[PDB]
Amino acid sequence: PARPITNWRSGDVVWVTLPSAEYAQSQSAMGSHPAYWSEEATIINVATGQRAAVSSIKWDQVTLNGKALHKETHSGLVYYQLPLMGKINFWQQGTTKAGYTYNYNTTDSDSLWVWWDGGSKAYLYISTYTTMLGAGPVNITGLGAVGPNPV
Amino acid sequence: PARPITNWRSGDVVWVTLPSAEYAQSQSAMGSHPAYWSEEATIINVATGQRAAVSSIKWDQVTLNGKALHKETHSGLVYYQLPLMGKINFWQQGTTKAGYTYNYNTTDSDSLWVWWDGGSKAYLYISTYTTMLGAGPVNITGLGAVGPNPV
Amino acid sequence: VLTQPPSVSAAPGQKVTISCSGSSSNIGNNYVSWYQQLPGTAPKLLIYDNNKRPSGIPDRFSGSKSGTSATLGITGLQTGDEADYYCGTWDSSLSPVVFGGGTRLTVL
Amino acid sequence: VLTQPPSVSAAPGQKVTISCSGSSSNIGNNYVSWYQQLPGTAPKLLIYDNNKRPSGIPDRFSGSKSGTSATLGITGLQTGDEADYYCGTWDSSLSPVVFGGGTRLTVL
Amino acid sequence: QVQLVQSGAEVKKPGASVKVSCETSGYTFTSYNINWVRQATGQGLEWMGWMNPTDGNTDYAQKFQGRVSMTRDTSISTAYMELSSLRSEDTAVYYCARGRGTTRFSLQNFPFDNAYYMDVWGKGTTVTVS
Amino acid sequence: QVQLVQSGAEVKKPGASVKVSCETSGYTFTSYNINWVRQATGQGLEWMGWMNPTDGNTDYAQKFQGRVSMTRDTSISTAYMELSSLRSEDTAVYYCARGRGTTRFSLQNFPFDNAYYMDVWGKGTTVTVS
């Protein structure tokens, strides 16, 4: 027995890899702000050691602290929210070339937004400020600490 | 058998807590830039699950990828560098109010600088831009991914 | 600059609040500390940052910053609380240390 | 604005480089792409970002950005490499898409 | 795959206006800027301006401002360029391209870390004037 | 513990200058700014200026600029204040305090997230003028 990847609690550490990430100029579920996204991203729970592809997770069954994730149906597409404590730390994979989020100046907290089709097609989104790492596609690794439930 | 806390490889995840952190105006082993530092900091290796107090570690025996950490003897004080990939993610403990580093606009990578007395007295330094979390003392939790050896 | 009630009175066991109010460049942007000054004594740090208590200050004292106005709270009044309380914050336009007018906390 | 050699020649089996030169607001601050144009054909993306090859571009092509000057590299020259190569980057002062003068890759 | 099919060659008198077309396929049309690049025969490439095919927003180079109008038809997924007051130095091949990257451009709003490249090009449209 | 011992009361004629001392103990003197705060009898607190006791850098309020000079003596760990051109409205208690926080102040250099408070105070120096 081990805690599955669809089980999260506050204080967990999430490791996300976004191979061939595309730069989105304005993401709907961020307030129309830039983001990187990949179709075949991978999500890892660092403490437990469990990992799975983002596109192969039933995101309506993912629970944080035993409760379902917050969802936003912007346009006709449903975006799931995975809150973080602190900012999302993303850098170009394999290189020490870091990226900074849109709210680089503020004391706000970031979140991992996922679009899920309902079958097996999921996109992982990371809030960014500009094309500091490139216009895409670019391999990107992220890192974050799982935050509390937005109530 | 388990990998000790004085054993690091690139890609490890470090969880640091800085209880009652003081705001330093200019840190010598940062380019004379602000920092938060704590006397009773704790260091955790998230994947392995090992943790120890920063003041209880022989920092001349801490090895990254089998090689000793880079040291800088600014003034009469020796500071040990633990390189990171990406920026150091630090926030107020227990709250979702996140601090941001000095190089919040650059693609640079941060590091965990440790002053070690040679006995049992160690200070953990986290780069910061201003008193965005306060003048101190303030409980601060940090998060980072261990980077490659600076050659 | 930072406004503050001239005086505040309360029952010898009742919660009472002391509130300042500044501009965007005073309180909405920076942290506001509180100072206690007994009559005939030097001022003493009461609250630092926005809601943090120094070692020695009893837990009945509290503070909070909401907008451009910040308040000082008490849980229970005692005889030794009869003092003068001051606001202090950072002014990015005037001076790094600005104060309020003060407030006398009396008993009814 | 972006300087570029008018012509570049090399042996049919020799490594050759094509280098541009910009200002601080051209190359030192932004990413520089490379485009290949065969005679009588539309331009084709050769290098995006600074050293990134699209799907289809052989690994012999390479690029690198060091300062305000960036270069285009080749590992081995072939018959089909005889084309015209252009620089492209972001200019924060003039236009988001600026080009160089171009360069003809001939054979000796 | 993704394609950018343009119109045929045009012969125009000096003083008229030429409208060139660019049909797009294989991708969501209202997702990437449609660029226009000019190249005089014997000269290098020259960016003319992009156009966001979702709000009609366009941004011309400071040489054609007042002589070029870039429109859109999202129903048929066809981008357009118009060039009026055709001078003698306008005989050139006009290219349609799809750009990927940052779209916000101004004199001083984002003076660093700006990546934008043209991924898929057209075939060119030779517009001669005489 | 850390202490701030000041000088005794001073009586000055109108037009002279008063020097007020502040000895430091219990902590590294060249590590925190030394603050000076005035309080006229019957009036509230008022910041007079700080001084970095490691470079001599000082920052006065825009009311005493030209009448106050804050020096330092790191050998004996004593901070100094001088107030010249004593007017009638200068009879006040002068306080020595130790500040903790950001020490960089400019009109527009850091217009957000600035925390600075006075941690340990002196006992006051009653300076009367008449």
Side-chain angles (χ1 to χ4, degrees):
Chain A
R3 190 177 72 189
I5 196 64
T6 60
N7 207 358
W8 294 96
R9 291 193 297 274
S10 298
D12 290 333
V13 162
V14 58
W15 189 282
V16 287
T17 63
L18 278 70
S20 294
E22 305 295 317
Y23 173 76
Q25 184 56 80
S26 78
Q27 179 65 25
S28 43
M30 313 223 177
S32 312
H33 298 106
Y36 283 126
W37 65 272
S38 180
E39 296 179 354
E40 293 177 350
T42 300
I43 185 165
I44 310 121
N45 191 321
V46 178
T48 61
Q50 294 300 320
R51 64 178 62 88
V54 174
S55 66
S56 64
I57 295 171
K58 302 293 187 291
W59 287 100
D60 70 348
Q61 270 144 63
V62 181
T63 61
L64 172 65
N65 288 317
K67 297 182 290 295
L69 265 62
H70 182 270
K71 64 179 180 180
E72 301 226 293
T73 59
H74 282 278
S75 174
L77 284 76
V78 63
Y79 294 94
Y80 298 85
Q81 165 158 246
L82 177 45
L84 274 67
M85 41 210 315
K87 300 181 186 306
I88 179 68
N89 191 23
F90 68 101
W91 61 93
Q92 186 175 1
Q93 180 180 2
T95 82
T96 61
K97 162 158 127 213
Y100 40 103
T101 67
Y102 179 79
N103 267 327
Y104 61 115
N105 266 346
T106 49
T107 59
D108 294 330
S109 295
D110 303 340
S111 297
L112 292 174
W113 289 92
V114 179
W115 174 69
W116 181 49
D117 167 334
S120 71
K121 293 179 179 179
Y123 302 173
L124 177 50
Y125 285 103
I126 296 174
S127 177
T128 80
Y129 183 72
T130 184
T131 55
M132 70 214 87
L133 298 174
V138 47
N139 275 245
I140 291 171
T141 299
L143 180 66
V146 177
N149 297 110
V151 299
Chain B
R3 192 177 71 186
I5 197 64
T6 62
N7 202 6
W8 295 95
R9 340 201 191 111
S10 297
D12 289 332
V13 161
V14 57
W15 189 282
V16 292
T17 59
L18 278 75
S20 294
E22 313 278 290
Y23 174 77
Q25 185 54 80
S26 295
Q27 186 50 43
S28 43
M30 295 195 175
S32 306
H33 297 106
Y36 285 138
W37 63 276
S38 179
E39 293 177 350
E40 294 87 4
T42 301
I43 201 160
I44 309 125
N45 191 211
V46 179
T48 62
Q50 313 286 340
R51 63 176 62 89
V54 174
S55 66
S56 64
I57 296 170
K58 302 310 145 223
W59 287 97
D60 55 23
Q61 279 150 51
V62 182
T63 49
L64 174 59
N65 290 318
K67 293 179 179 179
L69 266 63
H70 185 270
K71 65 178 74 66
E72 290 214 304
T73 178
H74 294 261
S75 183
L77 294 98
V78 194
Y79 301 74
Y80 294 93
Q81 180 181 3
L82 192 55
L84 273 69
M85 33 188 36
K87 301 179 187 294
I88 180 68
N89 192 31
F90 67 102
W91 62 94
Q92 201 174 357
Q93 180 180 2
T95 299
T96 59
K97 158 174 132 205
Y100 47 85
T101 66
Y102 179 80
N103 289 318
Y104 60 84
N105 289 337
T106 313
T107 60
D108 295 330
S109 295
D110 289 37
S111 297
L112 291 174
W113 289 92
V114 179
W115 173 68
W116 180 48
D117 185 75
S120 67
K121 293 188 179 179
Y123 297 177
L124 176 53
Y125 285 102
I126 293 176
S127 177
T128 78
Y129 188 71
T130 184
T131 53
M132 70 211 80
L133 279 35
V138 47
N139 278 245
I140 292 170
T141 300
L143 180 66
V146 175
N149 297 109
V151 299
Chain C
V1 179
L2 308 166
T3 59
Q4 204 165 0
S7 178
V8 152
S9 199
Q14 188 183 181
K15 296 187 287 186
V16 74
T17 62
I18 294 167
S19 174
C20 281
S21 86
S23 65
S24 67
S25 202
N26 289 106
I27 292 173
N29 279 321
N30 300 318
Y31 286 174
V32 57
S33 298
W34 286 87
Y35 301 94
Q36 176 182 7
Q37 183 177 184
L38 275 66
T41 74
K44 180 173 74 174
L45 180 67
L46 192 65
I47 290 272
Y48 73 98
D49 283 348
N50 298 309
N51 191 357
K52 299 296 183 181
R53 300 193 297 274
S55 292
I57 303 297
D59 50 352
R60 43 217 202 81
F61 292 95
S62 68
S64 48
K65 184 172 80 72
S66 296
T68 58
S69 171
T71 188
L72 176 70
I74 195 63
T75 299
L77 183 63
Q78 283 183 356
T79 304
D81 293 21
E82 294 177 354
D84 184 1
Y85 302 101
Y86 289 95
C87 272
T89 198
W90 189 287
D91 213 1
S92 298
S93 68
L94 198 167
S95 64
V97 179
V98 301
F99 293 106
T103 305
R104 288 180 184 176
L105 177 63
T106 65
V107 295
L108 184 64
Chain D
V1 182
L2 275 66
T3 319
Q4 198 165 0
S7 184
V8 153
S9 64
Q14 190 182 2
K15 296 187 288 185
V16 78
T17 63
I18 295 100
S19 64
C20 277
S21 178
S23 64
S24 66
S25 167
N26 277 358
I27 292 173
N29 282 322
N30 300 319
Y31 286 178
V32 57
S33 298
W34 285 87
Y35 301 94
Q36 177 181 4
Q37 182 179 4
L38 272 300
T41 293
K44 179 175 73 175
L45 178 68
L46 191 66
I47 279 284
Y48 72 98
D49 269 354
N50 293 317
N51 64 329
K52 287 279 170 322
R53 295 179 290 111
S55 288
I57 296 307
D59 52 352
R60 47 182 178 136
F61 292 95
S62 68
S64 72
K65 186 175 82 70
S66 296
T68 59
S69 177
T71 189
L72 176 69
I74 195 63
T75 299
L77 184 61
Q78 283 181 355
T79 303
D81 295 19
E82 295 177 354
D84 296 345
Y85 303 68
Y86 290 92
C87 270
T89 187
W90 190 287
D91 194 355
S92 298
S93 68
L94 189 163
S95 86
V97 183
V98 294
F99 292 106
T103 189
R104 288 180 183 177
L105 183 76
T106 65
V107 296
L108 185 64
Chain E
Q1 294 180 356
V2 317
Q3 306 212 326
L4 302 174
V5 202
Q6 311 187 194
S7 51
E10 296 293 326
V11 153
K12 303 300 290 185
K13 299 291 185 181
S17 64
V18 55
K19 185 186 286 184
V20 316
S21 93
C22 180
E23 291 180 355
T24 69
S25 54
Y27 75 97
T28 298
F29 177 62
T30 81
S31 280
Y32 300 100
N33 290 140
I34 273 299
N35 296 303
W36 291 102
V37 174
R38 181 171 70 83
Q39 159 153 90
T41 302
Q43 295 295 288
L45 296 173
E46 175 161 18
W47 181 71
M48 278 174 105
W50 64 47
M51 176 205 73
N52 196 1
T54 299
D55 205 9
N57 196 2
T58 178
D59 192 8
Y60 308 111
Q62 297 294 320
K63 180 179 259 217
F64 303 138
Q65 189 81 245
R67 298 171 65 247
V68 46
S69 89
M70 304 169 173
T71 80
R72 56 179 171 86
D73 276 333
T74 59
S75 65
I76 60 171
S77 75
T78 299
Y80 291 92
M81 197 246 300
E82 183 178 2
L83 204 57
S84 64
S85 295
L86 294 195
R87 298 177 65 189
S88 66
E89 291 179 354
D90 285 83
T91 303
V93 182
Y94 292 75
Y95 290 100
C96 183
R98 207 197 63 188
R100 319 233 326 271
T102 45
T103 292
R104 293 182 183 174
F105 171 70
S106 42
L107 268 302
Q108 187 181 3
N109 201 3
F110 300 103
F112 55 93
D113 289 345
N114 287 314
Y116 180 86
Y117 63 92
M118 267 138 303
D119 192 71
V120 165
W121 289 70
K123 261 150 213 191
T125 298
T126 302
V127 183
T128 179
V129 71
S130 52
Chain F
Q1 296 179 357
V2 317
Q3 318 249 306
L4 292 175
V5 202
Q6 313 189 193
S7 51
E10 295 293 325
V11 54
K12 303 299 291 186
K13 298 291 184 181
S17 64
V18 58
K19 186 183 286 184
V20 187
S21 304
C22 179
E23 291 179 355
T24 59
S25 66
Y27 77 105
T28 299
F29 174 59
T30 76
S31 185
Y32 301 108
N33 286 330
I34 274 301
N35 292 303
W36 291 100
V37 168
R38 187 155 76 121
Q39 186 173 355
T41 302
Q43 306 255 60
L45 293 169
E46 183 178 2
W47 183 71
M48 280 196 72
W50 69 50
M51 176 209 73
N52 196 2
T54 183
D55 204 9
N57 199 2
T58 178
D59 196 1
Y60 309 114
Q62 296 293 320
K63 179 187 239 196
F64 296 135
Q65 189 64 257
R67 294 171 64 247
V68 53
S69 76
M70 305 168 174
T71 79
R72 55 180 172 86
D73 275 333
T74 59
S75 65
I76 62 170
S77 75
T78 300
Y80 281 127
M81 198 216 48
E82 183 178 2
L83 202 54
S84 66
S85 177
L86 292 195
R87 295 179 66 189
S88 67
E89 292 177 353
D90 289 345
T91 299
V93 184
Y94 289 62
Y95 291 94
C96 186
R98 201 192 56 155
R100 309 241 324 270
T102 45
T103 73
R104 293 182 183 174
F105 173 68
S106 295
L107 268 301
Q108 187 180 2
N109 186 340
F110 299 102
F112 55 92
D113 289 345
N114 295 289
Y116 181 85
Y117 63 90
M118 272 141 311
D119 185 52
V120 166
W121 289 69
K123 255 150 213 157
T125 298
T126 303
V127 170
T128 180
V129 70
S130 67

